[PDB]
Amino acid sequence: PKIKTVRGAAKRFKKTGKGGFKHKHANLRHILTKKATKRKRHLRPKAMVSKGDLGLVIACLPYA
Amino acid sequence: TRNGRDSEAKRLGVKRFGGESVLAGSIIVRQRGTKFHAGANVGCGRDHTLFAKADGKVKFEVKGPKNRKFISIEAE
Amino acid sequence: GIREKIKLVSSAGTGHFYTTTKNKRTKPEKLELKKFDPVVRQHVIYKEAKI
Amino acid sequence: GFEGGQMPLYRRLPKFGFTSRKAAITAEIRLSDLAKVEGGVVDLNTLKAANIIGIQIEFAKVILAGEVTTPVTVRGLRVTKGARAAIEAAGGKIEE
RNA sequence: UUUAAUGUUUGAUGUUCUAACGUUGACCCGUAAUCCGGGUUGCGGACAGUGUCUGGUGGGUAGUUUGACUGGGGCGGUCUCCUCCUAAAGAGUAACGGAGGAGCACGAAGGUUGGCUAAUCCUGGUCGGACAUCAGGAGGUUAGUGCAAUGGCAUAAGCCAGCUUGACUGCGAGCGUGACGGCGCGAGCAGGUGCGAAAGCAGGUCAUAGUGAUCCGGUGGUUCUGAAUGGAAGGGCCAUCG
RNA sequence: UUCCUUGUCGGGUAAGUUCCGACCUGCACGAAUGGCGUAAUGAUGGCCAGGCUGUCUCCACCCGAGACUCAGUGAAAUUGAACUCGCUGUGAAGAUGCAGUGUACCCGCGGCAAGACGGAAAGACCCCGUGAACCUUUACUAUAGCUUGACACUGAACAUU
RNA sequence: UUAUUAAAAACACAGCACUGUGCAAACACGAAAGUGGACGUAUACGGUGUGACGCCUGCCCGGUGCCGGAAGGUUAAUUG
RNA sequence: GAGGACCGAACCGACUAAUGUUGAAAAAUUAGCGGAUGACUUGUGGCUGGGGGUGAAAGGCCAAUCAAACCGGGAGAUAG
RNA sequence: CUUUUGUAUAAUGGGUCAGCGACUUAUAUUCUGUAGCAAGGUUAACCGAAUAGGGGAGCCGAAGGGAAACCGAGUCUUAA
Numbered sequence: 020p021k022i023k024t025v026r027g028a029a030k031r032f033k034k035t036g037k038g039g040f041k042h043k044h045a046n047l048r049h050i051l052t053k054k055a056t057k058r059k060r061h062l063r064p065k066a067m068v069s070k071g072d073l074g075l076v077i078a079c080l081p082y083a
Numbered sequence: 084t085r086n087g088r089d090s091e092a093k094r095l096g097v098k099r100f101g102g103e104s105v106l107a108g109s110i111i112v113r114q115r116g117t118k119f120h121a122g123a124n125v126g127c128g129r130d131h132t133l134f135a136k137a138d139g140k141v142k143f144e145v146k147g148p149k150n151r152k153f154i155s156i157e158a159e
Numbered sequence: 160g161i162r163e164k165i166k167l168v169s170s171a172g173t174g175h176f177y178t179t180t181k182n183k184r185t186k187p188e189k190l191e192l193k194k195f196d197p198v199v200r201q202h203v204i205y206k207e208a209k210i
Numbered sequence: 211g212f213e214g215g216q217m218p219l220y221r222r223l224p225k226f227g228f229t230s231r232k233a234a235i236t237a238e239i240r241l242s243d244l245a246k247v248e249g250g251v252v253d254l255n256t257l258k259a260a261n262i263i264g265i266q267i268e269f270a271k272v273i274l275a276g277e278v279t280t281p282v283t284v285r286g287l288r289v290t291k292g293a294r295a296a297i298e299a300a301g302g303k304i305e306e
Numbered sequence: 307u308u309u310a311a312u313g314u315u316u317g318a319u320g321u322u323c324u325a326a327c328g329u330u331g332a333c334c335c336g337u338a339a340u341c342c343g344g345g346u347u348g349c350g351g352a353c354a355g356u357g358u359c360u361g362g363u364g365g366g367u368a369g370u371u372u373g374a375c376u377g378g379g380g381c382g383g384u385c386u387c388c389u390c391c392u393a394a395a396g397a398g399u400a401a402c403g404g405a406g407g408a409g410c411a412c413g414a415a416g417g418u419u420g421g422c423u424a425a426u427c428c429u430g431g432u433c434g435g436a437c438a439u440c441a442g443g444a445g446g447u448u449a450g451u452g453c454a455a456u457g458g459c460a461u462a463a464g465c466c467a468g469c470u471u472g473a474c475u476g477c478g479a480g481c482g483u484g485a486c487g488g489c490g491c492g493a494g495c496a497g498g499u500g501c502g503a504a505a506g507c508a509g510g511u512c513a514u515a516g517u518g519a520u521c522c523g524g525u526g527g528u529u530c531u532g533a534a535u536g537g538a539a540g541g542g543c544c545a546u547c548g
Numbered sequence: 549u550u551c552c553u554u555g556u557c558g559g560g561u562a563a564g565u566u567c568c569g570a571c572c573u574g575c576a577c578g579a580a581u582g583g584c585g586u587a588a589u590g591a592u593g594g595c596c597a598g599g600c601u602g603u604c605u606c607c608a609c610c611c612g613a614g615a616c617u618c619a620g621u622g623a624a625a626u627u628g629a630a631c632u633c634g635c636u637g638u639g640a641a642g643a644u645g646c647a648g649u650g651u652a653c654c655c656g657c658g659g660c661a662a663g664a665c666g667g668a669a670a671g672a673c674c675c676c677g678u679g680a681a682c683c684u685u686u687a688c689u690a691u692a693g694c695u696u697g698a699c700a701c702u703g704a705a706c707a708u709u
Numbered sequence: 710u711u712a713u714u715a716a717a718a719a720c721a722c723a724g725c726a727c728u729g730u731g732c733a734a735a736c737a738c739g740a741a742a743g744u745g746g747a748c749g750u751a752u753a754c755g756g757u758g759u760g761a762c763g764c765c766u767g768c769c770c771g772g773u774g775c776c777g778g779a780a781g782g783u784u785a786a787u788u789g
Numbered sequence: 790g791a792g793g794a795c796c797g798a799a800c801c802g803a804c805u806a807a808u809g810u811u812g813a814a815a816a817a818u819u820a821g822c823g824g825a826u827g828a829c830u831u832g833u834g835g836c837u838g839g840g841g842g843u844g845a846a847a848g849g850c851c852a853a854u855c856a857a858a859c860c861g862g863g864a865g866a867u868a869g
Numbered sequence: 870c871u872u873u874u875g876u877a878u879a880a881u882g883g884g885u886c887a888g889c890g891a892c893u894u895a896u897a898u899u900c901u902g903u904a905g906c907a908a909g910g911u912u913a914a915c916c917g918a919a920u921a922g923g924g925g926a927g928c929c930g931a932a933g934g935g936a937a938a939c940c941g942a943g944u945c946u947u948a949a
């Protein structure tokens with residue numbers, strides 16, 4: 020049988036050009052009044068998955 | 084009553100020692116107070132982190148009438 | 160645990176708003192400040208409203 | 211994805227975005243594919259007949275990829291400004 | 307102006323009625339049968355009872371949960387964060403090792419400009435006293451810092467006044483620190499603003515605690531999407547809440 | 549039923565942590581999850597006395613059945629391999645096997661059980677497993693049953709309003 | 710009475726009490742039909758506790774349960 | 790001539806001790822022991838079925854089997 | 870032999886011999902080697918005196934950025 024994608028991972032990681040994965044930052048869903056604007060601003064752009072975590076992502080997204 | 088609590092270490096101290104070449108913005112020393120003071124081409128962050136405002140070599144000096152330690156960047 | 164969260168709505172037509180805290184027991188008066196509105200790119204006055 | 215009980219990476223990160231149903235019916239065409247077509251004039255039907263785009267493609271865009279050498283008449287296709295120059299440079303013609 | 311009573315819709319019940327329905331009353335027949343069915347009759351009677359829906363009750367029954375650390379386990383204590391020591395003069399470093407704190411506060415206790423400099427004690431002095439306010443000398447920070455400790459602080463970061471909202475929006479060279487999620491510092495650039503004559507300073511507070519991922523959902527916005535098409539619903543994006 | 553506790557006093561014995569009687573200071577009795585009595589009953593618990601005795605001081609002899617020898621038949625558990633001594637030390641910390649040293653001709657038979665951490669049963673204790681079962685309850689979530697009302701099966705007349 | 714380590718002070722018991730039950734009884738076994746209760750009818754039957762007999766059985770209804778009450782508050786489906 | 794009366798065989802039971810414990814025996818033998826007209830015992834046949842039965846109640850018993858029998862199946866359950 | 874910080878260990882397992890007895894298979898996916906072809910590569914079902922040939926439906930690759938519309942060797946971010 021085909022490998023099944025972890026659908027939860029597919030909704031959180033997008034494959035980039037050179038094979039990396041981009042993802043949205045955490046800590047930007049709720050309580051935000053107490054967070055400094057500088058901190059919230061640096062969490063808006065998408066980030067690349069670190070080298071230590073690529074093994075977990077690739078295993079979960081075999082067809083990505 | 085009972086002990087057993089502590090906080091995580093903060094990794095303070097000197098990051099670039101005398102003579103080291105640094106880029107602009109490099110953190111030189113993290114400190115709680117101003118154990119070291121900002122000299123030439125060196126800024127003082129809100130937590131009194133001393134960072135290089137220009138490229139060059141860091142330099143430690145003791146100056147002033149209170150013999151305070153200053154850190155400056157010999158621009159090169 | 161007394162300070163309540165409030166929002167400051169811009170006096171301009173835009174729905175932009177800031178958020179802050181306030182001790183409504185000691186300071187019952189509404190908070191009014193001049194803050195930058197990034198929609199109209201001007202410093203307008205912001206008035207208090209419920210979160 | 212199991213990390214021993216710690217909240218795994220694909221669960222401690224937020225979900226984002228949505229899937230566009232229009233992107234599934236849109237394709238990109240390289241300049242090097244304009245010569246594979248039959249007849250010179252290219253459109254949706256001629257590209258599908260040449261097995262260049264899918265049968266369900268409704269929108270197609272020509273981009274500056276590869277190279278075109280013969281005069282080609284592009285019809286009913288969006289063309290990037292870089293590909294538009296290259297097509298006109300080879301005596302081609304672009305019509306909406 | 308108002309009031310009564312005959313006529314009506316819907317309820318609100320009840321006292322009658324019989325025709326549904328009940329009859330584990332009697333009698334007759336199927337039938338040489340205490341089942342059952344039919345018939346006659348009596349007694350009940352729109353009740354009871356059953357179906358669907360619904361509230362309550364429900365260890366009668368069922369499926370399960372009931373943490374870890376730990377000088378064995380239990381009991382007690384502890385579980386996140388901050389400060390000091392242990393820690394061996396970079397960083398880091400354990401124990402149910404030694405000591406303490408935090409789960410906030412503040413539209414001023416923030417910004418800026420201008421100014422200012424303590425503790426304690428002595429001497430003199432109405433009430434006035436060991437201790438109030440006044441004056442002088444000594445003293446030199448032994449004081450102060452919204453709160454623990456440590457490191458800082460006179461150019462004061464301490465104290466006072468004026469004017470104020472930079473407790474700005476978009477960004478960000480370059481670093482620091484983490485396995486990671488993350489967290490931290492940041493000159494400079496654009497837009498707009500405050501204070502100052504100006505150089506300048508300001509992206510909260512002397513610094514380090516004051517905190518909670520994701521999912522789901524709410525509220526506002528939105529030259530994004532809109533399952534034939536136009537809308538809409540829903541979704542996305544931005545801000546924010548639980 | 550009393551922890552302290554062999555409580556204290558009395559009785560019994562030369563001597564009684566038990567027994568019987570009392571005291572009340574009931575750690576922590578108590579009135580139908582009964583209280584206190586109670587003749588009779590008991591393969592019931594505790595204690596005393598007479599009788600009786602090899603229960604004992606302290607064993608002796610005897611009669612039988614085995615054990616032992618001969619003939620016939622003929623098992624079992626167990627078993628890494630063995631050319632399978634003592635001691636002191638050492639050492640996965642209690643040695644037939646290591647070190648040092650002592651002793652010891654080779655092999656049976658009858659006996660005895662100190663050791664071979666002897667045999668037997670993948671410890672019942674204890675802990676552990678995000679094991680199991682069954683049981684409990686004001687743990688959670690359900691649910692049979694019980695119960696409430698609405699609608700249906702289900703109609704008429706009339707009051708009361 | 711623990712067949713096969715427990716025969717007992719445990720269980721039962723006659724007696725006592727409370728409580729349910731008006732007969733198509735309560736109750737029990739049954740998706741139901743039905744059957745037991747009982748071819749019985751409150752001097753009967755079921756459940757619970759106690760346990761011959763003798764003398765007796767005190768106080769507490771706050772908690773939990775049960776019974777009664779129906780005014781008020783709250784409250785489901787339904788209705789819209 | 791009454792009695793869940795008395796003594797005591799058959800019969801039913803199982804209190805004590807010894808033996809046996811790779812037994813003669815997967816619960817017995819030997820010597821004593823309890824009941825022995827009764828809530829007695831026994832034969833033949835029948836009925837009750839597994840979250841069920843039955844239980845003078847020990848979680849006892851339900852074919853040397855019981856805090857949920859046995860047999861087949863899910864099934865190569867799962868086993869950090 | 871196993872298991873362990875550590876076993877002559879008096880920790881586990883084996884009386885002996887002979888036979889049997891444990892990293893497989895299928896389908897996906899990634900990487901390495903190797904072979905073919907190469908900006909292309911390859912067919913699946915199916916047809917077929919069928920391992921040929923046909924079949925290019927498809928799949929992967931030659932373009933990315935953005936949540937998306939969209940733009941495109943750039944794109945997103947932002948008023949820039």
Ligand SMILES: CC[C@H]1OC(=O)[C@H](C)[C@@H](O[C@H]2C[C@@](C)(OC)[C@@H](O)[C@H](C)O2)[C@H](C)[C@@H](O[C@@H]2O[C@H](C)C[C@H](N(C)C)[C@H]2O)[C@](C)(O)C[C@@H](C)[C@@H]2N[C@@H](COCCOC)O[C@H]([C@H]2C)[C@]1(C)O
Binds near residue numbers: 668669810
């Ligand atoms: C009559 C013969 C049976 O053994 C016994 O009866 C022994 C007296 C029995 O022990 C009795 C008596 C007892 C006092 O031990 C002496 C008691 O502690 C143990 C639990 O039970 C053995 C020793 C008793 O063994 C003791 O078990 C305990 C738990 C640990 C002891 N030792 C390792 C310390 C060990 O010696 C075992 C467990 O009974 C022996 C076991 C191997 C077999 N099973 C038992 C079955 O009957 C008993 C019920 O078991 C569930 O039968 C055993 C073995 C076959 C025998 C050998 O047949």
